[model samples]
Target: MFNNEPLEQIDKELHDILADEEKRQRETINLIASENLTNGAVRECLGNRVSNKYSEGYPKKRYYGGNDFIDKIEELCQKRALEAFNVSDEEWGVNVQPLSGSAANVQALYALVGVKGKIMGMHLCSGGHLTHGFFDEKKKVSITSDMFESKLYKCNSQGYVDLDAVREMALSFKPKVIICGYTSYPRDIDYQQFRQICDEVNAYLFADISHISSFVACNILNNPFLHADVVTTTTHKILRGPRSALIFFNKKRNPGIEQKINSAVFPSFQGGPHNNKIAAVACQLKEVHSPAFKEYTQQVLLNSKALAKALISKQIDLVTNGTDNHLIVVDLRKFSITGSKLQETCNAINVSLNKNTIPSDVDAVSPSGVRIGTPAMTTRGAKEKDMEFIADVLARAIKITVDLQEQYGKKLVDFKKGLPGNAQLQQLKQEVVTWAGALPFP
Candidate 1:
């Protein structure tokens, strides 16, 4: 897509890799909960000539020249974003600059709460992300929730946050901020209750709806804007935008709260914004605001529920018993298989998914479950019937892996090699592609 210096040749190499990725996309079914495919227009805008420029400031106040047109594009993006999320221009302010969801979360948190302030969020093993008070070596960030002290509430037997316990913890710890939302939670969040709890404690509430932004935008699920003091989301997941994030405040000027967030994101956390990505995000927001987006979100939910039912009918154990949103967490422990092994077998069968920790998982690496969702497939227009077929394939793949491991050993390396570019695998891949092809996107 480039034609300049030695960089042009490198660009060609990257394009080849991208082309291969597209082929893989076409050949397989992606059930990974955290990923979705953007439309061609969004992809084109992301790779456009705008990527060559660097616009490091807000719309009117840029550090660089030649930002006249870039400012308009960025402003448009912000406006569309506000509309899609149902945030009023007067009430909410968006910073569409964070490079990722995690960064946005960190910036948002730092802005809302002082360093080392008492923060309360869902436990990592209980479906929370690292940014939400979990320790990660790479980021070197640590947060202790109110629950870390005595009688911190954990998910119940149904793999859901205990709201009653959360209320009790809030009353005791009086955290500065109470975080709601999750990465792998399969049920709906009671934002109204969370907001009430935050109000009772006079604590700020931040909702990281990065995983379900599209669902919220399309009104298929609850919106966090009304309940949260601040909301952070990545545009890439359900929104199908470029790899970027948006952090916004529910109220315009909450007694210097917005300024705290801005300082945290800019001087403290990150540098210049990616202008080209901002433009792409703006375009995706436009798409999300379209009438068709509601239909797409409805289909996504339908597909998830249908697949979950199919899996249950096949005698597979689902964490939380089922789903109320776009993801299903399969409890491989019930099937006598590990999440890692099941993931490998699913990959072998051209059905892509990720190993995830269930509420009760002890090991972080080899979790007790696998997470599946329909964002990517729904982006490609797959429906409930398609989800049914996918569930069958997934069930069969898990069964084969379990049987092989029992008869032979845990290592399926020999089995994988023996089936290297095997005809059966290829055929399965083609079948998946054919099934996907039947459901063309608009």
Candidate 2:
């Protein structure tokens, strides 16, 4: 679909690539935890005339002219965003400007902690995000680590957040900000416990609920708005909108923090908010306020639990032993195959997933876990029963990967060389394509 001439007619090369990607999505199950599908209404908002303007500031407050309608769209976006989360204008302020989750986090932290300020977050291998200041002993892995004086808290031996250790570290470290939400951790966060720790250490509690904001919006998960001083989330992921982010600052509890965050998002951190994306986010927010969204999120949880059960029955080890949300982290160390190898093999068979480092792992390059989720497939109307089939395919893929690794040595290069001519993998690929292609595309 195109505004003027079809993209296929005007630019066949780029259009071919785009078409191929669409075909891929339609014919494969996407298990990527950080991604989801959007409706045509949202996509329409993203490609409309709203994108043609340069809206450099918030509604009615602009650095450039010709933002009259732009102001209305943005203000509407802000209103819907607050309503989606059931927060008041007097209590909360939202900035729908940051380009992605990382930018939103960086901007929020810059406003709250500043450069070189003490910041503490969950360790990356334990399900924390890179924007939470990931660093190793030798060097920084993210710009957050370089800019902020950071300390990381790890999970317990059972692969769950160690709150006692977090409190102990916070008491000693006395960080300016304590981030609670995570990227890959499957369990629900205890925001009240984190808030108590923050209160004890006098730290601002920032909740990065980018992965589970949809659940929170649906009232299926705990709302961070009540406990967190600052909350940040990408518009995509479980929210299923665009590749953008939103920052919510508690104006009542943390007075003037809203102004600081606005400044950080606008003049300091980024410029020219994507009005098109803002309009699309507003559309998603409207969708989030609907009854159907609750049903969808509930189904997501069901499918996730079912998938976890199937995997466990197949003797696949899971972090936290199960999930509390839409995602499940599979500890692949027991399979004696690196997460990367299993990821590549699954991709060959048309099942999209990602490599991740488990709690006990040190190496991120070739980590020992694969993270799976049910959001995208659930969006395509996959139910609990379908999760069983999906899990079977995943288990089989892992088994095939282990077998191949045994035959081809542990090196990635050697393992990949065996992929092109593998009969089992080729057969599996056909089966996956046939099954996935038969399913309805969202």
lDDT of 1 by residue, 101-121 (tens): 988987787777766677788
lDDT by residue for model 2 over 349-437, one digit each (tens)? 99999998887786666788999998989898888998888988998899899889889999999999878879998999898888888
Model 2, position 211, has a per-residue lDDT of 94
Off by over 4 Å in 2: 1-5
Worst 10 residues of 1 by lDDT: 143-152
- Which consecutive 10 residues in model 2 have the weakest lDDT in total? 1-10
TM-score of each: 0.90, 0.97
Pull out the clashing pairs in model 1. none
Q: Local error of candidate 1 at 359, Å?
A: 2.6
The TM-score between candidate 1 and the true structure equals 0.90
